[PDB]
């Protein structure tokens, strides 16, 4: 489409938009559900203000969350996209009984997306799966129509050739690649973007706005004032803007009502060319990165 070079719709023939993802909760046993209601609130007001599409992981102990959320919101099912992702570490004993179980703590019979939360594990840790195997378990879950489409996080190239090579035919190639990415990261792997958006899977973009997390300070932040100024809007919906130009799907962890409003609010306005070259330009000038700086080191 125009929003993005590779898109999807819900089961409702919906196009997917701009993900609020749940953040992670901490929590000191990790046997047991400790359903925050503060999150709860947060997911069904980002439904009530008109997000369409959850992000949660295994790994963020949000699961249940969502399915009270998916259960008390007016908002059917199918007009919701809910993505979710296997830890590898792992929680669970196979990605099969990870699927499971996010059904389960979910409280759905399919969800939209199922990614693998990252390529850095190894057997040991997943009880027998390498990274191919785990692939044949997300091929096996959407044959099973638990997951409609299944796709990775965390990946470089390599990791997304083991993928191509796991899958039995291209119906079942990976077509999301969820990667830390905001101008500082503008590649959180070499070429990762472009090749992804060549290869046909979307990019979602974790973390979009770790400049504004940041306690440092650079002409970054000079550049986000002016244009949040310029458009009436905030130095978040500026980042926003700049990720879905790039044609990234930007997952927001907002936490109050206006930070929820201003996170939907973000398609009556755009960045010249010009500007997203001021901020590729000042970005890639002050590299930042959050995230897995070892697994990365070299890639």
């Known amino acids: 489409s125009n929003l993005l070079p590779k898109t999807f719709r819900t089961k409702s023939g919906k196009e997917i938009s701009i993900a609020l993802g749940t953040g ?27 997000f369409r599409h959850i992000d ?38 196979s990605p099969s009984d990870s699927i499971d179980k996010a059904l389960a703590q979910l409280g759905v019979d399919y969800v939209d997306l199922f990614l693998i939360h990252s390529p850095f594990f190894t057997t040991e840790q997943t009880h027998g799966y390498t990274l ?58 070499k070429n990762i973007v472009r090749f992804c958006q060549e290869h046909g899977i979307l990019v979602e973009a974790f973390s979009p706005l770790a400049p504004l997390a940041r306690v440092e300070t650079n002409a970054l932040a000079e550049t986000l ?19 879905l130009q790039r044609g990234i799907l930007p997952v927001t962890t907002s936490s109050k009502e206006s930070r929820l409003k201003e996170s939907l609010n973000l398609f009556d306005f755009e960045l010249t060319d010009e500007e997203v070259n001021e901020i590729n330009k000042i970005g890639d000038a002050n590299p930042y990165r959050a995230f897995f700086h070892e697994q990365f080191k070299d890639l």
């Open 225 to 243: 004032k002016r244009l949040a100024e310029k458009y009436k809007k905030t130095e978040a919906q500026v980042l926003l803007r700049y990720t």
């Open 56 to 93: 949660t992981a295994e790994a963020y102990n949000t699961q249940k969350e969502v399915g009270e959320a998916l259960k008390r919101t007016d908002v059917p099912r199918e007009d919701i996209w809910v993505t979710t992702k296997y830890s590898p570490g792992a929680y669970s004993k």
């Open 24 to 50: 992670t909760k901490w929590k000191q046993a990790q046997t047991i559900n400790d359903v925050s209601t503060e999150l709860v609130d947060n997911i069904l007001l980002g439904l009530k203000l008109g």
């Open 132 to 189: 191919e195997q785990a692939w044949e378990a997300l091929v096996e879950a959407k044959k099973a129509g638990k997951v409609r489409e299944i796709g990775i996080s965390n990946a470089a190239i390599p990791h997304l050739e083991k993928l191509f090579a796991a899958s039995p035919s291209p119906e079942y190639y990976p077509v999301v690649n969820q990667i830390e990415f905001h101008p500082f990261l503008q590649n959180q792997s």
